Amino acid sequence: AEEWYFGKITRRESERLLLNPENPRGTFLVRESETTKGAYCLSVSLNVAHYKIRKLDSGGFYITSRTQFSSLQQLVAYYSKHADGLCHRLTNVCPT
Amino acid sequence: PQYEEIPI
Ligand SMILES: [Co+2]
DSSP, X not given: OOTTEXXXXXXXXXXXXXXXXXXXXXXXXXXXXXXXXTOEEEEEOXXXXXXXXXXXXXXXXXXXXXXXXXXXXXXXXXXTTOOTTSSSOOOEEOOO | OOOOXXXX
């Protein structure tokens, strides 16, 4: 649950790590958002896309309202099976 | 600049 979580890393640095030529499409990491407090961000790779992971006041997370999760790990497991709206399916955890 | 949105 920690592997793909890079925490407080900048958007610029997440793009720099994801854009490594060794990383296949679908390489990703989850991080804290720099513009929206309380929310996270899923960065996936070749270009990088950034998705805001919003948090409901009751608890859960979601990128789009039609697909909600109890946690970041439930969100990651879901998009690792189907991109379902994302640019690509989550395939690889970004190397440190 | 911005973020990608899952299409509606
Ligand atoms: Co299927």
